[PDB]
Amino acid sequence: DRINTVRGPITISEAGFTLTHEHICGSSAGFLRAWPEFFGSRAALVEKAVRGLRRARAAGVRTIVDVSTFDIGRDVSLLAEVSRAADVHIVAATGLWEDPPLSMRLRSVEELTQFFLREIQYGIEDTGIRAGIIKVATNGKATPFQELVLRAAARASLATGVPVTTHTAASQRDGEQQAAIFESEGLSPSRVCIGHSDDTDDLSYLTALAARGYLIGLDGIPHSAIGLEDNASASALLGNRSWQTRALLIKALIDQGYMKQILVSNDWLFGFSSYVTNIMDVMDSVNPDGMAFIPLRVIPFLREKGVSQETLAGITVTNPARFLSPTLRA
Amino acid sequence: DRINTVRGPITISEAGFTLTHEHICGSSAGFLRAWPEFFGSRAALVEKAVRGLRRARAAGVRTIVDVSTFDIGRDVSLLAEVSRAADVHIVAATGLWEDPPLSMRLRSVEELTQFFLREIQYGIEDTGIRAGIIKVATNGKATPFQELVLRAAARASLATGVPVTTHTAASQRDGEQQAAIFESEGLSPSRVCIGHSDDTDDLSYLTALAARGYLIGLDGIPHSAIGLEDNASASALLGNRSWQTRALLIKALIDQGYMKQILVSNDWLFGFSSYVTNIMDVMDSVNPDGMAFIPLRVIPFLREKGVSQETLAGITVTNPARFLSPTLRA
Numbered sequence: 055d056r057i058n059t060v061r062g063p064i065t066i067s068e069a070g071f072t073l074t075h076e077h078i079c080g081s082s083a084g085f086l087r088a089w090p091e092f093f094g095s096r097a098a099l100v101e102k103a104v105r106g107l108r109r110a111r112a113a114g115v116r117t118i119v120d121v122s123t124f125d126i127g128r129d130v131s132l133l134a135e136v137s138r139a140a141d142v143h144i145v146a147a148t149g150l151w152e153d154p155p156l157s158m159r160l161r162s163v164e165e166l167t168q169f170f171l172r173e174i175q176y177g178i179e180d181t182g183i184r185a186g187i188i189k190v191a192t193n194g195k196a197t198p199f200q201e202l203v204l205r206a207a208a209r210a211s212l213a214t215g216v217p218v219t220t221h222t223a224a225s226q227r228d229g230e231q232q233a234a235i236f237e238s239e240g241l242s243p244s245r246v247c248i249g250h251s252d253d254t255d256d257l258s259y260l261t262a263l264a265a266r267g268y269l270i271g272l273d274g275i276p277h278s279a280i281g282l283e284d285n286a287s288a289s290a291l292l293g294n295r296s297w298q299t300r301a302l303l304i305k306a307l308i309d310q311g312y313m314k315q316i317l318v319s320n321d322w323l324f325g326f327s328s329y330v331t332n333i334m335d336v337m338d339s340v341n342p343d344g345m346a347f348i349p350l351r352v353i354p355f356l357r358e359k360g361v362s363q364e365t366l367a368g369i370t371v372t373n374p375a376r377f378l379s380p381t382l383r384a
Numbered sequence: 385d386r387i388n389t390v391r392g393p394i395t396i397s398e399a400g401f402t403l404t405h406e407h408i409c410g411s412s413a414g415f416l417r418a419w420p421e422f423f424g425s426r427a428a429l430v431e432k433a434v435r436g437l438r439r440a441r442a443a444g445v446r447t448i449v450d451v452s453t454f455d456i457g458r459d460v461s462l463l464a465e466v467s468r469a470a471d472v473h474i475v476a477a478t479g480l481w482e483d484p485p486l487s488m489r490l491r492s493v494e495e496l497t498q499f500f501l502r503e504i505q506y507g508i509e510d511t512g513i514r515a516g517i518i519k520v521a522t523n524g525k526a527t528p529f530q531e532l533v534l535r536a537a538a539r540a541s542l543a544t545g546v547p548v549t550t551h552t553a554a555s556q557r558d559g560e561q562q563a564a565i566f567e568s569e570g571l572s573p574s575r576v577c578i579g580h581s582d583d584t585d586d587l588s589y590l591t592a593l594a595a596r597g598y599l600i601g602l603d604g605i606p607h608s609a610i611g612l613e614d615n616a617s618a619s620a621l622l623g624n625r626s627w628q629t630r631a632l633l634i635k636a637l638i639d640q641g642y643m644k645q646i647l648v649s650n651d652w653l654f655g656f657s658s659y660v661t662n663i664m665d666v667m668d669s670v671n672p673d674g675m676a677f678i679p680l681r682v683i684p685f686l687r688e689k690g691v692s693q694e695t696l697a698g699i700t701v702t703n704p705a706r707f708l709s710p711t712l713r714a
């Protein structure tokens with residue numbers, strides 16, 4: 055009956071309209087503390103994030119799930135500061151993404167489970183802030199270490215009821231192997247979001263995951279380099295499918311009977327050091343609405359395509375609450 | 385005329401007997417803050433390091449150079465705490481070792497130079513503690529990113545006079561390429577230590593570096609898995625050459641006229657998370673003297689082999705002072 059946020063436990067009804075895959079800052083462990091000038095200053099990043107979350111809140115957002123891990127440079131005191139100033143709930147993450155350091159890559163499945171449980175059950179660092187989701191990643195076939203991470207995430211979820219959310223190379227159908235590993239540990243698909251699933255048009259892949267009870271993360275709707283002329287780095291990151299193409303996958307899965315299993319988000323950030331310099335400025339040019347893109351552009355677009363207000367409320371409010379609510383089977 | 389330590393500037397004469405390549409903790413950025421229980425506790429690691437540095441000090445050590453970078457999980461407040469409690473000067477490092485995260489790997493030569501200068505000229509994180517050495521690494525042919533690091537280290541040294549110290553795959557003769565890159569940026573060899581040079585017996589390699597004016601880091605003298613039975617992970621890390629074999633390289637370079645260019649150390653640690661679990665316990669079984677191994681075992685061994693007290697004082701006191709003393713040409 056409670057979800058952990060960076061400001062403490064909230065009731066399910068307090069979560070309201072929830073963006074399930076977002077970032078305050080996409081960075082690396084220790085980087086914001088060691089090199090804050092990369093972002094102008096820590097104060098400049100805070101001010102940018104507060105302004106952005108205030109615009110999201112004015113557009114109807116009440117909660118974001120910051121799926122930044124240890125290795126995305128998650129700074130839960132930064133999330134707490136921004137959450138307080140913007141009056142937007144932030145759920146923090148544990149887990150590991152695609153850039154673990156050696157001190158994490160050399161660990162066993164049991165050691166990793168201990169670390170994920172620490173962040174869920176005790177707190178992140180010395181902050182007492184507890185994660186309300188476990189984030190994991192593959193980019194194609196899982197590395198041996200990534201198989202241990204997915205198993206440890208499953209064990210941590212089985213002990214606590216906290217859900218798992220994933221990064222995929224969606225065009226490589228990674229969710230199939232992620233599902234296989236999770237299920238081998240006994241994890242209910244109802245506790246798992248297969249993310250970056252809007253990066254593919256393959257309905258045979260998306261419905262194979264949805265049919266076995268996975269939540270489908272259509273989480274990068276504004277990610278598009280269409281229109282950016284001669285920017286190879288932005289094209290490699292964002293792809294050349296339109297936001298409309300991505301958004302129509304929401305409608306596709308509704309039309310196949312999966313409205314209760316869809317989670318929608320922007321996968322936006324206010325700082326981004328783990329890619330090319332100045333990527334944040336390019337991304338802000340593409341999508342000046344930032345995290346407000348879902349409510350301001352995607353919801354009206356789907357309404358115009360014949361999706362009901364009730365169905366979209368179920369996707370943006372009911373599904374996130376059912377996902378985030380701790381349980382072994384949702 | 386001053387060397388920066390974790391407790392502030394010290395005079396050259398205050399450095400005294402100096403171990404030029406050591407670690408309080410060999411970890412990863414953010415790891416000790418996020419998972420202190422890996423080490424038992426932060427307090428247990430502090431107590432172990434203080435006990436070890438007190439034993440070194442009783443054996444005659446006055447200063448260690450902690451060559452832990454950002455990506456070795458350098459915690460300068462941990463170094464300051466241990467330095468104060470043990471009454472042993474600690475020089476901190478900037479630079480990057482072999483485990484940089486994406487937020488560092490995507491940076492340009494100019495950006496990296498800015499970051500290294502920040503840690504030398506302004507301070508590490510928000511601590512005001514300034515690095516007194518730049519640490520860099522290759523493991524065989526430099527990656528493209530490692531070429532940028534070595535160039536940025538050279539630029540940072542050329543601006544400040546702070547020396548550069550390296551990690552090599554010594555058996556792959558990496559110091560030849562490291563020298564080539566440093567010299568292409570205009571860096572004096574007198575400002576550079578080519579480290580882990582005791583990992584090779586190739587005198588053709590070691591004298592090629594020493595002849596052009598490089599300092600030679602014979603920095604892993606107690607690293608040996610001889611005697612450890614059936615421990616593949618310890619054998620891969622420590623090698624199967626004896627500490628005596630490593631120590632006799634000191635005598636070899638003295639006998640070739642390079643006594644002023646030799647730097648000796650243990651490359652010891654009090655915590656080690658970036659390798660297999662329990663490696664610290666295996667290493668402590670091999671070398672119970674820890675950082676005191678140089679003064680307690682190596683110095684007497686070299687005296688027994690006919691090296692003078694005066695020559696060994698020049699290696700352990702004069703050479704480190706000449707190396708660490710900021711200058712463009714030593």
Ligand SMILES: CCC1(C)CCCCC1
Nearest residue numbers: 308360361362364365366
């Ligand atoms: C029948 C699918 C539906 C019209 C349900 C109401 C929300 C919009 C989708």
Ligand SMILES: CCC1(C)CCCCC1
Nearest residue numbers: 638690691692694695696
């Ligand atoms: C001649 C080399 C030397 C005997 C000099 C004094 C110290 C030991 C080495």
Ligand SMILES: CC(C)OP(C)(=O)O
Nearest residue numbers: 080081126221321328
């Ligand atoms: C910056 C990283 C976390 O972004 P992503 C694009 O994997 O969601």
Ligand SMILES: CC(C)OP(C)(=O)O
Nearest residue numbers: 410411456551651658
């Ligand atoms: C733990 C790391 C820094 O050790 P090394 C063995 O490269 O000196």
Ligand SMILES: [Zn+2]
Nearest residue numbers: 220221222250
């Ligand atoms: Zn991702």
Ligand SMILES: [Zn+2]
Nearest residue numbers: 075076121321
């Ligand atoms: Zn993301």
Ligand SMILES: [Zn+2]
Nearest residue numbers: 550551552580
């Ligand atoms: Zn090394």
Ligand SMILES: [Zn+2]
Nearest residue numbers: 405406451651
């Ligand atoms: Zn070292």
